[PDB]
Amino acid sequence: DLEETGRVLSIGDGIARVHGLRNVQAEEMVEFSSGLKGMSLNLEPDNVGVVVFGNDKLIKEGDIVKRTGAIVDVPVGEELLGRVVDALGNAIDGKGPIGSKARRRVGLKAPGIIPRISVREPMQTGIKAVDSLVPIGRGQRELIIGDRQTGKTSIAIDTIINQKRFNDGTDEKKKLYCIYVAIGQKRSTVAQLVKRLTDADAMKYTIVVSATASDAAPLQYLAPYSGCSMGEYFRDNGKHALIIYDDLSKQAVAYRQMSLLLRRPPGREAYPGDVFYLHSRLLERAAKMNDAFGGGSLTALPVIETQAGDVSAYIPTNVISITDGQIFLETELFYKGIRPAINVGLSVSRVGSAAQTRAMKQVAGTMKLELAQYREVAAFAQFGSDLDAATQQLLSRGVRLTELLKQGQYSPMAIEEQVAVIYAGVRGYLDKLEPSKITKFENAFLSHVISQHQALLGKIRTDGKISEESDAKLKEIVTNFLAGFEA
């Protein structure tokens, strides 16, 4: 017979009101006269509102739109681990012919009740403060929230860098396939970043899905979903993949725009409603799956970089209802030089502990508290005003722990290092030190155990946990070492 041909009724603005193609399946990829792609978004009574992938000016009225007749799919695969692609999986890297063996439909649903499983399998970031105070596992959704360069980028980076050892660890519950959807991040930024991942060569276990700043909107819009499909791929290949969706903020804008441009409503706060749904489903497609799915996971660390603590902010409010907690990052600390940034109370792991190392939990349990009480008094008469002694200490302690809760720029950890230092503080050993010297301790201490007490570190990694002995081994090491560190 005849092939499904059709025409661009009118075009401008990447909005092709489109003739014909009645047969149109929803979110069917069309193929344009301009060789471009589009998505048949609005199936209108007599036409198709078609989102133009990329630019429009190539196009003009009456131009033929031929159905491609396909609802989109994306390449999925793990060659990708060690690939920076755009969402369609194209070698923006310039690596060329991407190993991208599968492609997989982007619209593949989030697993069932029964398919899933609760998280309780650890995860970590190498960021003590983080792993400690938000104890982590796989399959998650957690909002990473903070401003431009609230180590912002850094945040992702250390987390990723930390996984290196884990990726040098052999599990899926170690080797975390990292997926960075870079949204609205101009190429220079990305380039800059990319360079980092390579250097960290964490890139090897990492896909970077990149829809830069310039990008046409659907592209950016799509990218997470894309990312989503790809990670579900891992998930179903057992694999516990880490997606960092970076950022939905950027998406939101684009998308909102998209609606509007489609004339279609946005919604509440002037921005789309079911962009929540967008995400809700997107992020539901991240899960910690049962065993059937090879334990399946996608741990999702979605990101929003905030303007003015606008959490009140529509999507944030939304998101707030969605994640498994949110990581509040605080600048003040950054300017203070303090890195981590965090406001902790604001940071939350709703999940908390279940994915946490007992090792840490055991020392950290105590820390959270030490800070907790500390925090009220952290707030109290902060100035050169006395306190009762108890509290003079807690404050000292707290302060120490703060230093401890700093973590260097591009300096990931491992749980034992962390536990070690936590142990150090918990067991009070460095209240002793006036605060500046903590950092010196920690490093020195670390390089020290790194020399000897890998015996211990290795062990602690092994037991996953502190035994009374390990404690005892610690106890001396630190005390004496500490003594050595000092004097």
Partner: protein, 467 residues
């Protein structure tokens, strides 16, 4: 009759039914539906075209596609047959343990009971939890709103409530996890199973689970509300019960409606709300009650939009709230279990009448007392002691005991706690605190009351703490 997809703009599937148009609220079946795609008629738009909302698929959809009108609104499984089944919005096994064992179907739009059908007086429901009954005495059929802490075991408590009530009454439960995380419902599920509130052995557990999670079209979640209602109507009327209806959260409901409002081109409202916010709530609330068959006592977990209530809906909600729960994360943190905000464990329905003065007054004394103790707390806190006179101390202490008596050992989380969820008949309660208040017990320690249900179990423990 058939309709054709004429336009799909999102999950508003614009259908021209080319043949006869059925109700509005009509479920239409899109033919070509691998998963039954109910379109719910929303408008008879004119020109034989209806506006529908797709509740399944929203992609791959071929325009023109044939829809054969289901000729009525949605029908969903009902009867007891829902119990211990995780039904989704369509009322369909997301238990994924096979089908629901239904026979009865229901339109999830059932209509609000008549004026006569109301048990005009809704009369205090007692939960067997002191803190609850006393401070927030429930009304049978009542809508209770729950503000309350994450991961506390709201749910734990709830489970315990189910235990106490749905178990210790003919009440069954319907849980509509609206917009909830599939994940938490999963965790919970296993947990529920685990808890025995869901029993994988009571095929008819005291809970039917209904989920209408976020990852659905809003409408589905929105309608999961109706659904849940529909089930509960079965248990109320049919099973004569006090159905416990967990709706979690109305915030998500309202919001879900509102999400559509836009798209529907509806003018929403101030604060963005759907215009229909009121009706949405209202009819639904009106559809909940105490019939003269049973009660659908609605316990609504309430995520608080914008953490205010001024956000119109909760204010409105208040119109329908009559027992209010603010949980005190702090009290819980005091290791107190259960550990609500006591003074904001409240009910408009506390009365020297309905719940009688014994309750009321004792409570008034208590509530006051707690506060008074609170007042003194402020002083002493800062000034060390014998900053009081010890009648104040005594009351403080009495209050502490009273405080502690609200703590109750736990059954569901007996796995953690050890002990068991204890249940407190009202008189023992009223009496109980009154006695403590009366200092009649004050010559005994306070942890006595800690982890106790019955005032006796407190007394017994009092003795026991006096070794």
């Amino acid at each position: 009759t058939t309709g054709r997809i004429v336009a799909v703009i999102g999950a508003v599937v614009d259908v021209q039914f080319d043949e006869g148009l059925p109700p509005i609220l009509n479920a239409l079946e899109v033919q070509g539906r691998e998963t039954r795609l109910v379109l719910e008629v929303a408008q008879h738009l004119g020109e034989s075209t209806v506006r529908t909302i797709a509740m399944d698929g929203t992609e791959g959809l071929v325009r023109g596609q044939k829809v054969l009108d289901s000729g009525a609104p949605i029908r969903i499984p009902v009867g007891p047959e829902t119990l211990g089944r995780i039904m989704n919005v369509i009322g369909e096994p997301i238990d994924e343990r096979g089908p629901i064992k239904t026979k009865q179907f229901a339109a999830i739009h059932a209509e609000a009971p008549e004026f006569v059908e109301m048990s005009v007086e809704q009369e205090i429901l007692v939960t067997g939890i002191k803190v609850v009954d006393l401070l927030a005495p429930y009304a049978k059929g009542g809508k209770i709103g729950l503000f309350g802490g994450a991961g506390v075991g709201k749910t734990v408590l709830i489970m315990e409530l189910i235990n106490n009530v749905a178990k210790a009454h003919g009440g069954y439960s319907v849980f509509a996890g609206v917009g909830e995380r599939t994940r938490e419902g999963n965790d919970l599920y296993h947990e529920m199973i685990e808890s025995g509130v869901i029993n994988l052995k009571d095929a008819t557990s005291k809970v039917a689970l209904v989920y209408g999670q976020m990852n659905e079209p809003p409408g589905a979640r929105a309608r999961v509300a109706l659904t849940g209602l529909t089930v509960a109507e079965y248990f109320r009327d049919q099973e004569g019960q006090d159905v416990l209806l967990f709706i979690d959260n109305i915030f998500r409901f309202t919001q879900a409606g509102s999400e559509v409002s836009a798209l529907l081109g509806r003018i929403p409202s101030a604060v963005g709300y759907q215009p229909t916010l009121a009706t949405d709530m209202g009819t639904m609330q009106e559809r909940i009650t105490t019939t003269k068959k049973g009660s659908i006592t609605s316990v609504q977990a309430i995520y608080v939009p914008a953490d205010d209530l001024t956000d119109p809906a909760p204010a409105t909600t208040f119109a329908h709230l009559d027992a209010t729960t603010v949980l005190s994360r702090a009290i819980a943190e005091l290791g107190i279990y259960p550990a609500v905000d006591p003074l904001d464990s409240t009910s408009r329905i506390m009365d020297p009448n309905i719940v009688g003065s014994e309750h009321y007054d004792v409570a008034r004394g208590v509530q006051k007392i707690l506060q008074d103790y609170k007042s003194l707390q402020d002083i002493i806190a800062i000034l060390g002691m014998d900053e009081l006179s010890e009648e104040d101390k005594l009351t403080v202490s009495r209050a502490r005991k009273i405080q502690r008596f609200l703590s109750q050992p736990f059954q569901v989380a007996e796995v953690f706690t050890g002990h068991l969820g204890k249940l407190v008949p009202l008189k023992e309660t009223i009496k109980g605190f009154q006695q403590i208040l009366a200092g009649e017990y004050d010559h005994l320690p306070e942890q006595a009351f800690y982890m106790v249900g019955p005032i006796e179990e407190a007394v017994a423990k009092a003795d026991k703490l006096a070794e």
